[PDB]
Design a protein around this ligand. Structure first.
Ligand SMILES: O[C@H]1CN[C@H](c2nc(-c3ccc(F)cc3)no2)C1
Ligand SMILES: O[C@H]1CN[C@H](c2nc(-c3ccc(F)cc3)no2)C1
Length: 338
């Protein structure tokens, strides 16, 4: 459709202008009050903060430079910030500011108070097909956008999909996203969502995101992932096997679409001559109005319960640790471009 082709051509022009001249150093730490830890990992965490002059709330991702170096995440961290400052799409969390100091790297993002899709899925058990289809359509459009910019996302899982005040998705965590025109080789991603070609250490491409969409749709509609097992090595054996079992409650159209979980990447939907259109035109999506979804004109199946833009009740509790800043600069060379 020409209107879609023209939209994507403008989207790539605007991305490239920011990609080639990235913003830097657009805030500082003492402009914000720290409120609460929203999540934690091996080299970073995310904290709710409030801007002291405007009163606006944000989610601030804080990375310790020395730990980034030690866990071999330098390039990944530079990818994350350079991509986030350049993209713009209705279903991607927005980067508002970025900066660094002697000790840390900071990405200040919009705060989405409805919490992770993962929490809501585990509460209710499983989503109906219409409810799963509403979220899946947003991921299909987001991947069409990212792939047209030559970006692979590589971290799709329910924990990275936040639910906003209108019940739509905001994708967060660009820590494994990368600009790739051909193949790439890094081992990364959560075990249950890895495509076979990642597990087998091959040069892989954007088809790994369409595989991960198949895992996400199965998990939303079943309540558990298709290759579940107790330990990673057992998960990986099931992934490479070519076999999947579907619950009897799945529709025949859903089973047929889940062409996404095709072990041969050269036969996988999203990676054929018609690209994303094989997914968008599949019978499981026959009731989906793609333009209305993009315009946020569809009524969502679920509106999260929260009291206001500072409420943290849809996130969980972590031990609260200091944000320390050394008097000496650490790892200045490695992070020059941030
Ligand atoms: C745990 N929380 C988050 C998060 C990221 C962005 C937000 F807006 C809100 C929360 N990422 O990991
Ligand atoms: O053998 C026992 C122990 N684990 C099994 C299990 N059942 C599910 C499940 C989750 C959500 C659903 F909607 C449906 C089923 N997850 O684990 C049952």
């Amino acid at each position: 459709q020409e209107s879609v082709k023209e939209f994507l051509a403008k989207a790539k022009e605007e991305f490239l202008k920011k990609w080639e001249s990235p913003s830097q150093n657009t805030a500082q730490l003492d402009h914000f009050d720290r409120i609460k830890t929203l999540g934690t990992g091996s080299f970073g965490r995310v904290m709710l903060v409030k801007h002291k002059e405007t009163g606006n709330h944000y989610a601030m991702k804080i990375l310790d430079k020395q730990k980034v170096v030690k866990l071999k995440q330098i390039e990944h961290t530079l990818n994350e910030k350079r991509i986030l400052q350049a993209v713009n799409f209705p279903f991607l969390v927005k980067l508002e500011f970025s900066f660094k100091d002697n000790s840390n790297l900071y990405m200040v993002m919009e705060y989405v108070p409805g919490g992770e899709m993962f929490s809501h899925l585990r509460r209710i058990g499983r989503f109906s097909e219409p409810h799963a289809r509403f979220y899946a359509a947003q991921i299909v459009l987001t991947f069409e956008y990212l792939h047209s910019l030559d970006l692979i996302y590589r971290d799709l899982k329910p924990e990275n999909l936040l639910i906003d005040q209108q019940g739509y998705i905001q994708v967060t965590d660009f820590g494994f996203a990368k600009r790739v025109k051909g193949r790439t080789w890094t081992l990364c991603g959560t075990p249950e969502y890895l495509a076979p070609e990642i597990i087998l250490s091959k040069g892989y491409n954007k088809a790994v995101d369409w595989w991960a969409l198949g895992v996400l749709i199965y998990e939303m509609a079943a309540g558990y992932p298709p290759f579940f097992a107790d330990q990673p090595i057992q998960i990986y054996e099931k992934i490479v096997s070519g076999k999947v079992r579907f619950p009897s409650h799945f529709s025949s159209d859903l089973k047929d679409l889940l062409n996404l979980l095709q072990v041969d990447l050269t036969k996988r939907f999203g990676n054929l001559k018609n690209g994303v259109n094989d997914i968008k035109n599949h019978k499981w999506f026959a009731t989906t109005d793609w333009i209305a979804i993009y315009q946020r004109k569809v009524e969502a199946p679920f509106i999260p319960k929260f009291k206001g833009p500072g409420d943290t009740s849809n996130f969980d509790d972590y031990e609260e640790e200091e944000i320390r800043v050394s008097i000496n600069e650490k790892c200045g060379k490695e992070f020059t471009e941030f």
